[PDB]
Scaffold this active site. Sequence first.
Site, PDB file in Angstrom:
ATOM      1  N   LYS A   1     104.204 129.294  52.548  1.00 44.90           N
ATOM      2  CA  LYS A   1     104.314 129.746  51.174  1.00 44.90           C
ATOM      3  C   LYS A   1     105.481 130.666  50.832  1.00 44.90           C
ATOM      4  CE  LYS A   1      99.546 128.702  51.539  1.00 44.90           C
ATOM      5  NZ  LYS A   1      98.486 129.284  52.356  1.00 44.90           N
TER       6      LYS A   1
ATOM      7  N   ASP B   1      94.840 136.755  59.514  1.00 45.63           N
ATOM      8  CA  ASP B   1      95.372 135.507  58.999  1.00 45.63           C
ATOM      9  C   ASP B   1      96.345 136.040  57.949  1.00 45.63           C
ATOM     10  OD1 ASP B   1      96.020 133.274  57.507  1.00 45.63           O
ATOM     11  OD2 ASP B   1      94.002 132.418  57.561  1.00 45.63           O
TER      12      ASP B   1
ATOM     13  N   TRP C   1      88.209 131.332  53.183  1.00 47.65           N
ATOM     14  CA  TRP C   1      88.971 130.102  53.155  1.00 47.65           C
ATOM     15  C   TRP C   1      88.103 129.134  53.965  1.00 47.65           C
ATOM     16  CZ3 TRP C   1      92.917 128.120  56.938  1.00 47.65           C
ATOM     17  CH2 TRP C   1      93.800 127.201  56.339  1.00 47.65           C
TER      18      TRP C   1
HETATM   19  C1  LIG Z   1      98.197 128.787  53.596  1.00 46.60           C
HETATM   20  C2  LIG Z   1      97.099 129.481  54.442  1.00 46.60           C
HETATM   21  C3  LIG Z   1      97.078 129.331  55.869  1.00 46.60           C
HETATM   22  C4  LIG Z   1      98.040 128.522  56.734  1.00 46.60           C
HETATM   23  O1  LIG Z   1      98.658 127.417  56.123  1.00 46.60           O
HETATM   24  P1  LIG Z   1      99.642 126.495  56.876  1.00 46.60           P
HETATM   25  O2  LIG Z   1     100.023 125.526  55.803  1.00 46.60           O
HETATM   26  O3  LIG Z   1      98.880 125.825  57.972  1.00 46.60           O
HETATM   27  O4  LIG Z   1     100.764 127.275  57.356  1.00 46.60           O
HETATM   28  C5  LIG Z   1      96.066 130.007  56.539  1.00 46.60           C
HETATM   29  N1  LIG Z   1      95.105 130.790  55.926  1.00 46.60           N
HETATM   30  C6  LIG Z   1      95.117 130.934  54.561  1.00 46.60           C
HETATM   31  C7  LIG Z   1      94.015 131.821  53.983  1.00 46.60           C
HETATM   32  C8  LIG Z   1      96.109 130.279  53.840  1.00 46.60           C
HETATM   33  O5  LIG Z   1      96.068 130.463  52.493  1.00 46.60           O
END
Ligand SMILES: *Cc1c(COP(=O)(O)O)cnc(C)c1O
EC number: 2.6.1.1
Lengths: 396, 396
Positions: free
Chosen positions: A246, A211, A130
């Site tokens: 999510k 994460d 990411w």
């Molecule tokens: C969605 C996501 C997050 C955190 O998202 P927030 O909208 O800040 O809660 C962190 N790491 C990954 C890989 C994600 O897909």
Amino acid sequence: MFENITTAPADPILGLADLLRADERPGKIDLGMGVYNDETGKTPVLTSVKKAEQYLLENETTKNYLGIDGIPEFGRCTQELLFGKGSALINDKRARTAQTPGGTGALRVAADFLAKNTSVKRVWVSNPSWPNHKSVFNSAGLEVREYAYYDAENHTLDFDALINSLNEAQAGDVVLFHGCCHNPTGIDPTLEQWQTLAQLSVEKGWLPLFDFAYQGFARGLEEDAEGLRAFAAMHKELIVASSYSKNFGLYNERVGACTLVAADSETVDRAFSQMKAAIRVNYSSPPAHGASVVATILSNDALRAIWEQELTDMRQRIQRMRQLFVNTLQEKGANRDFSFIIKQNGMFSFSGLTKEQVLRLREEFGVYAVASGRVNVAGMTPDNMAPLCEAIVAVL
Amino acid sequence: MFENITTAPADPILGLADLLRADERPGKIDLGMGVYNDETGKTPVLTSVKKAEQYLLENETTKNYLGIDGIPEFGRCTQELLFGKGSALINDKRARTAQTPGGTGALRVAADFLAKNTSVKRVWVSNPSWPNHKSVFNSAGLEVREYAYYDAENHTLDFDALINSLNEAQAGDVVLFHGCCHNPTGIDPTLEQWQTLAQLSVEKGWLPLFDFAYQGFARGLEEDAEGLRAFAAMHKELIVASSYSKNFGLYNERVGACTLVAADSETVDRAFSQMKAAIRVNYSSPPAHGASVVATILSNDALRAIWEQELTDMRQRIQRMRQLFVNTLQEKGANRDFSFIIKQNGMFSFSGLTKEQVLRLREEFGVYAVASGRVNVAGMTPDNMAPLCEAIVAVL
Ligand SMILES: *Cc1c(COP(=O)(O)O)cnc(C)c1O
Ligand SMILES: *Cc1c(COP(=O)(O)O)cnc(C)c1O
């Protein structure tokens, strides 16, 4: 003083929103940012969430500041979700949780905490990973190194390359793992591999940082956490940055948590005091609404039952679209076999499309995907599937 | 890795909450953190806010991520409140506003922005000042210097000392000013002094940074902003960190804003892109609920009228308590004259009590105040006034 400031580079994912904004064309297809869409192509508020918000509207009597670490109930419900209701970590009080503004906020807090209070100097992330991972840790002054992970040729996890990559990781180094639904590949380690990684980690002296933003989107709530639990069973110390953006559809309310685990309660309480210091100098205390909604739902049998079903419905609709996507590609005369995407978990599909193909899809067809070839399956509907695939087949 | 971490020192203000928690005694009096209390000693949700939350519950159709800078409407309403509905700054598009998690969040974003994108190395704050000011800027790697401000002997603003203190401030330095209701003194510059400071600032080449967290608590919304507006009329560049925690009673929803002003729209847009980059690597995007409530109220004639009246009611109740406080002290046989506190604006009273007297008030009477002698007048009620003053008179 601002005369010579340089224009900041656009974010590869969040920047897609701006482009979509400017695009005046009619039937654009947004397959970028990872947000859930229903059959109608809308991102609705869960019913369980609306009911919780109703409850809060009627019962909230104050907006007085929360403690630096947020709502205590939120923290407890978060730990149960992560480690299991009867976990030893909870009973031995070896874990402390701070409510944070989203999972991204949790990552920043963890980074600031590590940079100022430990000897940590390097963080290892997967390749690919990411994009904001490198950005966040770099801002805290920590260097990021990559470890092999995805086999672009076989569309699978190259476990051998992974291990060999990590052998260059020294004790005291932080290794970042995605709890489940690896973003962007969608390929996760099997339980056996998680177990092997857990043992290796202990022996090499790495500090695991999970994460966990998609719990519930791979197989189920408990199942998606078995990897983390395998680690928590062998490690004295761990850090988990989780998100409810999510699985609760609470994206814009910024609901996440940073959980710290140590050998004993005395040590974790001491370390946690420094995590709170890191938060104090950032945003002081977290936003109540989002986390209150989550705590209300998780602590109420009725609301929890409804929420779990909605989560199940979201996961199932994505799986449906995933199969329909592959079939339609074959139906439209796809160049190569795309069956490998059926093996990926989560909202995404790491298609294999090149940067130019992605650029062309946007320019000529109004189909928006991430430059890495990542496409948001959860953004697909029975209605846009046809034009979506015709465009893709056209650039192969 | 966490074995040797040291226990973080308690926060002089936020830490009072923890102590109050542990104190099992019955009639404790909380005069610490600056939160508004009604005649009942409760911190209620404004009626205008409840109505707005009702509106959102019925009309919100998604929780999809907001842009990095937040709700556009929120930003516009914020700029009008700060500079004035028909301000040239707005017409010439010289200002950009990012919605942030509270005013504290705005301060951190400003600090990260300055530290990474400008030559700024020092920030000047008043003596005394809000303790978190030094902490926040220090975390960003900026050094903090103090400038004379309060005359402890005459209980007034020592304007001559202020100017002389600031002559040691070099061009390119940041000077922080409280918009109104100086925390903790309650002593603000008169319009003439603001004007003089504005001219000096321009000539010396300082970059003004306004912490505006109490707009509406001194005299009124427009009046409390004339100091800032005097500055905005002469400066090409400014930064304003504002908060809605107190004037909207939205403490725990974390609602604030960081406004950036430059010579022209081209320059501010360029600089703002770097502010967004600083936010991206922190919490990504801001929490929607709190800011949505504020934008809804400010953009609706009906709700706005009700809110303004509630703000007026809060300001008036504090002023009542302030006079009752002085009278009761005299009535209870106060040692010295405390009439000087009638001259202070805001929720606080910078009493002059020593650290030991504050410690004793807490230990022996269960009366909680900040070590600096700052007491929260807004926490006083007709019911706790008597015991409150008896305790104070007892330690003089
Ligand atoms: C969605 C996501 C997050 C955190 O998202 P927030 O909208 O800040 O809660 C962190 N790491 C990954 C890989 C994600 O897909
Ligand atoms: C209340 C306050 C702030 C900001 O508070 P938030 O709760 O973070 O919005 C900033 N500066 C001063 C002096 C304040 O009193």
